[PDB]
Amino acid sequence: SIRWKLVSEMKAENIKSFLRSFTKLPHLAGTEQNFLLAKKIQTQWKKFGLDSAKLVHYDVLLSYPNETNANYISIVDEHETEIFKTSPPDGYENVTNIVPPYNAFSAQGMPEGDLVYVNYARTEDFFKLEREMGINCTGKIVIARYGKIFRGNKVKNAMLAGAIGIILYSDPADYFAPEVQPYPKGWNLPGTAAQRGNVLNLNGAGDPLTPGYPAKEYTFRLDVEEGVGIPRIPVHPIGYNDAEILLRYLGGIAPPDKSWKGALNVSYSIGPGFTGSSFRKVRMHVYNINKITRIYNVVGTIRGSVEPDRYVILGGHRDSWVFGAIDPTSGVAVLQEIARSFGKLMSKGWRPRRTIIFASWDAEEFGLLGSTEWAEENVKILQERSIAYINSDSSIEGNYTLRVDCTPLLYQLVYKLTKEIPSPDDGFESKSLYESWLEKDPSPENKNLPRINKLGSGSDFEAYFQRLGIASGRARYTKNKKTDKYSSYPVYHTIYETFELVEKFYDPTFKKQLSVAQLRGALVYELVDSKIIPFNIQDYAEALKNYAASIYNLSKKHDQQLTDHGVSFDSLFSAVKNFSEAASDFHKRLIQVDLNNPIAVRMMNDQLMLLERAFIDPLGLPGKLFYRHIIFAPSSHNKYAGESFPGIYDAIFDIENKANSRLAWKEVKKHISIAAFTIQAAAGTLKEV
Amino acid sequence: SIRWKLVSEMKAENIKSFLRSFTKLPHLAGTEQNFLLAKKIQTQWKKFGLDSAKLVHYDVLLSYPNETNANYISIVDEHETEIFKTSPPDGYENVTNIVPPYNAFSAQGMPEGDLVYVNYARTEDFFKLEREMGINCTGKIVIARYGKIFRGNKVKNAMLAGAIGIILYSDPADYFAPEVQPYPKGWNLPGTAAQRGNVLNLNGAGDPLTPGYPAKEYTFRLDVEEGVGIPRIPVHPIGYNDAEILLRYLGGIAPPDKSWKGALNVSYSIGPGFTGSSFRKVRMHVYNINKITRIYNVVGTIRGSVEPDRYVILGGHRDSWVFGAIDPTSGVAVLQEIARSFGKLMSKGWRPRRTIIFASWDAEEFGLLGSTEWAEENVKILQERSIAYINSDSSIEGNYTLRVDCTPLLYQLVYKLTKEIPSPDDGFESKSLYESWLEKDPSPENKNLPRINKLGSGSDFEAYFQRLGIASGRARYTKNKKTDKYSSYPVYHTIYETFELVEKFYDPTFKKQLSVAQLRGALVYELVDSKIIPFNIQDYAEALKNYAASIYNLSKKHDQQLTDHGVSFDSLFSAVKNFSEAASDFHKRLIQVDLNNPIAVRMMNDQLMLLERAFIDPLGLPGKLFYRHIIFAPSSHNKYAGESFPGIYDAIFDIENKANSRLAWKEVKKHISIAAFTIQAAAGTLKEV
Numbered sequence A, B: 001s002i003r004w005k006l007v008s009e010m011k012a013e014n015i016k017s018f019l020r021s022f023t024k025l026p027h028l029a030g031t032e033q034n035f036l037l038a039k040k041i042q043t044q045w046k047k048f049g050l051d052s053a054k055l056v057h058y059d060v061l062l063s064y065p066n067e068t069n070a071n072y073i074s075i076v077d078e079h080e081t082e083i084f085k086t087s088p089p090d091g092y093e094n095v096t097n098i099v100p101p102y103n104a105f106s107a108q109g110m111p112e113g114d115l116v117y118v119n120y121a122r123t124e125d126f127f128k129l130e131r132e133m134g135i136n137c138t139g140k141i142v143i144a145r146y147g148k149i150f151r152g153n154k155v156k157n158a159m160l161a162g163a164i165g166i167i168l169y170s171d172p173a174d175y176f177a178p179e180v181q182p183y184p185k186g187w188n189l190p191g192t193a194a195q196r197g198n199v200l201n202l203n204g205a206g207d208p209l210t211p212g213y214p215a216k217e218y219t220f221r222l223d224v225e226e227g228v229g230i231p232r233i234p235v236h237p238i239g240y241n242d243a244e245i246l247l248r249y250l251g252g253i254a255p256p257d258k259s260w261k262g263a264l265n266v267s268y269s270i271g272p273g274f275t276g277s278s279f280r281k282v283r284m285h286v287y288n289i290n291k292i293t294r295i296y297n298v299v300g301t302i303r304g305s306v307e308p309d310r311y312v313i314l315g316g317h318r319d320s321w322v323f324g325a326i327d328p329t330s331g332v333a334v335l336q337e338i339a340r341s342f343g344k345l346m347s348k349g350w351r352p353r354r355t356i357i358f359a360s361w362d363a364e365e366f367g368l369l370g371s372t373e374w375a376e377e378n379v380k381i382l383q384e385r386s387i388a389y390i391n392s393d394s395s396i397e398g399n400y401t402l403r404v405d406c407t408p409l410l411y412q413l414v415y416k417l418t419k420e421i422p423s424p425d426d427g428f429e430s431k432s433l434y435e436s437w438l439e440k441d442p443s444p445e446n447k448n449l450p451r452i453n454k455l456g457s458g459s460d461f462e463a464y465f466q467r468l469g470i471a472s473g474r475a476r477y478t479k480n481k482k483t484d485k486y487s488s489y490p491v492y493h494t495i496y497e498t499f500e501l502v503e504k505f506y507d508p509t510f511k512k513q514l515s516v517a518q519l520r521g522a523l524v525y526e527l528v529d530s531k532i533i534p535f536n537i538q539d540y541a542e543a544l545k546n547y548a549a550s551i552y553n554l555s556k557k558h559d560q561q562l563t564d565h566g567v568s569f570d571s572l573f574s575a576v577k578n579f580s581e582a583a584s585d586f587h588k589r590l591i592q593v594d595l596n597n598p599i600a601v602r603m604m605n606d607q608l609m610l611l612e613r614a615f616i617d618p619l620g621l622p623g624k625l626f627y628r629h630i631i632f633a634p635s636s637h638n639k640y641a642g643e644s645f646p647g648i649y650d651a652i653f654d655i656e657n658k659a660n661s662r663l664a665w666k667e668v669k670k671h672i673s674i675a676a677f678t679i680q681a682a683a684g685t686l687k688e689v
C-alpha cells in the first residue's frame, strides 16, 4: 500500500543525520541561528518536492538576559556583606552564544528578605503552608523545586501567596535517576546545571502583547506593563549545588512529612529565616529584558487533488533553549524525514486527497508563540477546513514505550496504525508497536487497550485544539512510569541536551525515533488520504460517559450542599445519553453512504470534521478567553495536564473554602448547564434531519 | 421557470384572507391566543406539504402589567393631593384582553420629583442639556417624545443622565401625518392612544436570564436582578392628550431652538418644575411584573434533494402588542402565502437543491427572544450550514415604494429579482418593481441603482447576521422619506393596528403586500435552488471601500490628534485593497468552475457561504459580547440603525470629551487594527492557495 511505502521509506539513519546536523549550535528563538535553521528546513522541503515552503514572520515579545547586568541570587549578612552568590558540554567548548540560565519573562527586581521553602509550589503546597503549617509567605522570597507542574503555575501560585521573588531549582529527587552517572558519563543532571524556561501564565493567549490577533507589523500592541501573563515578581533558576547552600541553614518548622523532603543533604526545614550560621537574608538580582523580536515559522504544503480546501497539519517547533537535542530537535529531525518520505511518494506520481500543511514553528519555548500567532492569522480558514493537527515536538523523552495523547476521535486510528508499525523494543523483534505498547502501558479503563491520555497543554497543538476545536494528537517515546519517578528527563531544558546524549544513552540505533516518525507520518497520511475521515464518534461518546461519571463522583462529598443549593447533574447525564444515541445513529448511517456520490460523502465528512468544533464556546472559560473547549482545558493548576469538564471542575474545586456558598454553588450550576447544552448541541450536529 | 411559477402562484386575495384570519384577536407573546396562532400556522404548513412543522419552546423572561395594581402618572400639589392622573377600536368592543399600554421590562417604582423635558432623549439631546443648556437631569423625572431612535436607547440615556423615571409620549409632530384624520376616519394616531414596546438594552443577548445559551428547562438562569439589559428606573408611555397636560405648565428655560418644539399647543419649555399653575410635582406609579413564561416558535422544513445540509431560513415573528395588523401580522400573512406557494411547487414534484427552514418566531416584541433563543440552540449547525436568512416581519409600513436592507452579498440578487416582479404602484402597470423603486428611491452612491440600506437591528435577523455572520436581508413597502416626516407609521404599536386600517388606508388591493411576498419568496428560491450561490463578493469589496472612506472622513477633524498619538488608517486601507483584489480573483475563478464536478462546485459554494462568517469576531465588540460582526453593528445610539466599522466609530465618537486622551486614542488604534485584520482574514478565505 501507499501507507506501507510511506512508512518503510523512513530510515533511522536519516533521522540520526538530520538530528546531528541541527544540534551543532544553539538555536534560541529570535536569534540568527534559529533563522538560519528555518532557511535550511525550507531549502530541504523544496528539495523534497513540496508544493510550497515559505517563511511566515511575526514580531512578538521575547525575553533574554542582559549581557551587561547578569542575574544572580545571593545571601547577605546583617552588615549587607555578600557571603554567597549563585553562579559548555565536552566537544562544545568553542560555542560562544549559549544563553545563561534564566526564566524568560521574569519581572525585574532586587528583592531581599527571609527565605521560605515551598516544596513544588503547587496549589496543594501553598494550601498546606497557609492552612496547616502556620506559614505566611507574604513578603518572603520563596524557594521551590521544579517538577510535577508547569513552572509558570508555580510562579502564579507564589504571587497569589504574597511572595516577593521565587527561586526555582532542580532537586536530585526529581532530576537525578538512581544509579545513573551525571553527564557526560551518564544521562543525569550535574549539580552545576539549571533548567531554563518561560514563566508566563498565558492561558492560550499567544504573544503577550497581541491577544486574539496575529502580531503583524501594523498590529495594535498592549503596553508592555499590561502584556498578558507576565509575572510581577522576579524568578530565576539554579542548580542543586547552589540550592543546597541556600537550603542548608533554613530554620523554623521541620518539613511536615517526607513528601516535602528532596534528596539533598539538608533538613528541608521551611523557614522563614536561617539558623546555625553569616547567613541572614536572601537577595535576588534579575534584570532580563523583554523586547519585541521577529520570529519565523516555515509553512509548506502538498495540495490535495480532490479536496484541496481540507487540511491536515503536521507541525512541530524548532526553537530550543540551547542545543535542544531532545526538545525539540528530535522532533525537528522526525518532521524532516516525514516530509522527505511524502516527497518520495510524490516523485512516483502520488498526490494526497486533501492538503497537507507542514509547519516548523518558532518561539514555542516562549509560550507557543509562533504556532499560536499563525492560528490567529489563519483562524477563518483553519476552523472551517481543518481535519486534524498532528504535533512533531520531542520524539524521545525516554526509551521504554510509546505515549500518545489525543482526542477520542483519533483513538481507533492510533490503535490501527500502531499494529502495522514494527516495534523498536528489544525482545519484540517480530511484533508490532501496538503489541509492545499494550504490554508496557495498558489503559486503566480497559486492560486490553494501550493507555491514551487526554490533551493538556505545553506544546503547539494548544491553540488548534483548545481554542479552535481541531482534532489533535501527539505521540512520542517515554520512560516507564511504574519504575522511573523523576520529572520530564534529567537534562531537560539544560545545556546537556546534546546529540551525544541521545545517541549514547537514549536510542543508539535510532529505531525508537524511527517508530515515532512512522506513526506521526502514518497518522497524517490516513487523515489526508482516506475518502471517509477516520474518526470514530462512538469512542467520544464513551469518553463523555467516563468524564461525566468522574465529575459526578468528585461532587459526592458535597451531597448535602448539592441538595441544599438545588444543584443537579441530571442535565449533563441526559445530554451524554443523547450524544451516545446520536453517535450510534451517525455511524449506522455512515456505513450506508454511497462512496460513489461525492456530495453524500462530503456531507458526512463535514459532520466528522465539525464534530470537535461543536465543543468550542466562543465565550471561553471563566477568566480565560482563549480556552474555549468545554470538554477539555489545560488544568488551572498545571498547564501540562488536561482536565475534563474544566468549567465544572474549577467551579467545584476547593468550594468548601469559598466565602460565599450561595454564589459558589450557582457557579457550579452555570457550568453544568453549559456542559449539558454543549454536548446536546454537538449531538445535534450529527443528526440526519 | 420554477421561479415564475412560485411568484405567479401567490395571490393578493390569499394574503388578505390570511391577514383577516390572524387579526381578529390580540396575540401577545406568552398568551393563549398566540399559542393558538402557532398551532394554526403549524396546521397550515402541514396542509401545504412541508416536510416538518414543529413547535419549539423556550421559557424566557417576559413582562406584563399587574391587573390589580394599574400603572399611571400623576401630578400632585404641595399638599400631596392628586390633581391629575393619566388614564377597543370600532368593531372590537367585545375583545376583553387587550393589554393596557406599558413599557415591558420597566423597573417598578413610585418616583416623585420635578419634570424636565428632554426632546427625543437622544445622545445629542442629553449632550445639549448638560453641555449647552445648563440642565442637570439628576434626580428628575424626564419626559421624552417617542421617535427617531429605539425607545430602549432613550431609557439607557435617561439612566446615564441620572433621571429617576422616564415618561415616553407620542407627539403629533412625529405620529400625526398632515391632513389625515385620526382613526377610524383616517390612519392617524388619536390623542388617547399610547405606543407599547420593550425598553431593554440587550445588545443582542436574547432572553435576559440566559445570555449565550438557549432557555431550556434545565438551563442556568441569572438572578432576575442581574438579567441583561433590564432598566433600573420606571418607564411608562402616554398619548398626547395626557402629555399636553404634563408639558403645559413647565417653566424654566425656553426651548433652545425649533428642533426641540413638537406640535402640541404648549411652550416646550424645559423645566425643571412648573410655573403658572396646583401643579407641583410629577409622580410615576409603575408595577409591571416580570415572569418566566413559555414561548413557542413554529419551525418547518423542506429538505434539499442535493445539499440537505445547507439552509436558507425564511423567518418572521407572529407575536404582536395588540392585533398587530401591520406589525407583524402583515408579514405573518406573507409568510403563509410563500409557504403555500412552495407547497404548490412540491405538489408537482419539485424539491429544492438545499433545505428551506421556515420559522414563525415568538416574543420578538420582548427583545427578539424566540428567534435569538433558537439561534443559540442551533448555533453549531446554523453557523456551518446556513446560506442566508430572509426576514418576514411587517410587509406594509407605508404605500410609496420598496425598502430593502441587506448585506452587500445580496445586492445583485435583489436587483435581479425586482426586475422580474410586476410593480404594484399606480402608474407603473406595465413596468417592474425595480423600475418603480429606482424612480422613487435612487441610491445616493449611484443614481442608476435603487437605494439598499445597511442592516441594523430591531427585528429577528439580528442574531443571524450580527452574532452568527449569516447573510441576511429584509424587504417591505414603506413611506416616501422626502415628503413623509413622521416616525414609523402613526398607529405603530397601538390598539389601532387593525385589519381595517391596512385594507382601507394602506393597500386596499393587497397588491403592494403581494409584491413583497413575491420578492421574499423569490429570494429564498434563488438562494436555495441555484447551483452556484447567488452572492457577489465584488459588491462587498466596493461597500468596504465606501465604509473605509467614511470612517476616515469622520477622523479628519482630529488630524492633529491622529498625528500626535501615532494613529493611522493605512492598515485598514491596505486590507480593503487586498480584499478587492481577492474578490476580483475569486469571481474570475468562479466563472471557470466545472459545473459538472460536484466537489469543485461545493468548494466554491463553501467560500461564498463562509465569506460573511469571516467578519465575526468571537471576542465581540467592547461591552457587547453578542455583537460580533466587525463591519456592521446596531448603532450604540439607536438599535434600529446600522453602523459601519462600529468598533472604530464608537472609539472615536465624542473623543474630544474623553478624560484620558492617551487611553482614548489607543482604543481607536486597537479597533483600526482589528478591522484591518478581519478584512485581510476575510480576503484570505477567498484565496485559491
Ligand SMILES: *[C@@H]1O[C@H](CO)[C@@H](O[C@@H]2O[C@H](CO)[C@@H](O)[C@H](O)[C@H]2NC(C)=O)[C@H](O)[C@H]1NC(C)=O
Pocket: A571, A572, A574, A575, A578, A676, A677, A680, B216, B217, B218
Ligand atoms: C435529551 O433528549 C431528551 C428527549 O428529547 C430530552 O428530554 C426532554 O426533556 C425535557 C426536560 O428538559 C422534557 O420537558 C421532555 O418531556 C423530554 N422529552 C422526552 C424524555 O422525550 C432531553 O432534554 C435532552 N437532554 C438535553 C440536555 O437537551
Ligand SMILES: *[C@@H]1O[C@H](CO)[C@@H](O[C@@H]2O[C@H](CO)[C@@H](O)[C@H](O)[C@H]2NC(C)=O)[C@H](O)[C@H]1NC(C)=O
Pocket: A216, A217, A218, B571, B572, B574, B575, B578, B676, B677, B680
Ligand atoms: C495587503 O497585502 C500586502 C502585500 O502582501 C501586504 O504588504 C506587506 O506589508 C508589510 C507591512 O505590513 C510589509 O512588511 C511588506 O513588505 C508588504 N509587502 C508588499 C507590499 O508586497 C499588506 O500588509 C496586506 N495588508 C494587510 C492589512 O495585511
Ligand SMILES: *[C@@H]1O[C@H](CO)[C@@H](O)[C@H](O)[C@H]1NC(C)=O
Pocket: A066, A067, A068, A069, A289
Ligand atoms: C542592560 O543593563 C545595563 C546595565 O544596567 C543597562 O545600562 C542597559 O540599559 C540594559 N539594557 C536594556 C536593553 O535594558
Ligand SMILES: *[C@@H]1O[C@H](CO)[C@@H](O)[C@H](O)[C@H]1NC(C)=O
Pocket: A136, A137, A138, A139
Ligand atoms: C500575612 O502577612 C501579611 C503581611 O505581613 C498580612 O497582611 C496578612 O494579614 C497575613 N495573612 C495571613 C496569615 O493569612
Ligand SMILES: *[C@@H]1O[C@H](CO)[C@@H](O)[C@H](O)[C@H]1NC(C)=O
Pocket: A187, A398, A399, A505, A506, A507
Ligand atoms: C535506555 O534503554 C536502556 C536499555 O533498557 C537502559 O539501560 C537505559 O537506562 C535507557 N536510557 C534512558 C535514558 O532511560
Ligand SMILES: *[C@@H]1O[C@H](CO)[C@@H](O)[C@H](O)[C@H]1NC(C)=O
Pocket: B066, B067, B068, B069, B289
Ligand atoms: C400585583 O399587585 C398586587 C397589589 O399590589 C400584589 O398584591 C401582587 O403581588 C402583584 N402580583 C405580582 C405577581 O407581583
Ligand SMILES: *[C@@H]1O[C@H](CO)[C@@H](O)[C@H](O)[C@H]1NC(C)=O
Pocket: B136, B137, B138, B139
Ligand atoms: C447634578 O446633580 C447631582 C445631584 O444633585 C450632583 O451630584 C451633580 O454634581 C450634578 N452634576 C452636573 C451638573 O454635571
Ligand SMILES: *[C@@H]1O[C@H](CO)[C@@H](O)[C@H](O)[C@H]1NC(C)=O
Pocket: B187, B398, B399, B505, B506, B507
Ligand atoms: C396610500 O396611498 C394613497 C394613494 O397615493 C394615499 O392617498 C394614502 O395616503 C396612502 N396611505 C398611507 C397610509 O400612506
Ligand SMILES: N[C@@H](CCC(=O)O)C(=O)O
Pocket: A197, A198, A364, A365, A366, A367, A368, A457, A458, A459, A639
Ligand atoms: N514547552 C515549553 C513552553 C510551554 C508553554 O509555554 O506553554 C515549556 O514547557 O517550557
Ligand SMILES: N[C@@H](CCC(=O)O)C(=O)O
Pocket: B197, B198, B364, B365, B366, B367, B368, B457, B458, B459, B639
Ligand atoms: N421590533 C420591536 C422589538 C425590537 C427589539 O427589542 O430589538 C420593537 O422595535 O419594539
Ligand SMILES: [Ca+2]
Pocket: A205, A206, A207, A209, A210, A211, A212, A213, A214, A215, A373, A376
Ligand atoms: Ca497575537
Ligand SMILES: [Ca+2]
Pocket: B205, B206, B207, B209, B210, B211, B212, B213, B214, B215, B373, B376
Ligand atoms: Ca438565551
Ligand SMILES: [Cl-]
Pocket: A331, A391, A392, A393, A394, A459, A474, A475, A476
Ligand atoms: Cl509531540
Ligand SMILES: [Cl-]
Pocket: B331, B391, B392, B393, B394, B459, B474, B475, B476
Ligand atoms: Cl421584514
Ligand SMILES: [Zn+2]
Pocket: A317, A327, A328, A364, A393, A394, A459
Ligand atoms: Zn518542545
Ligand SMILES: [Zn+2]
Pocket: A327, A328, A365, A493
Ligand atoms: Zn521545551
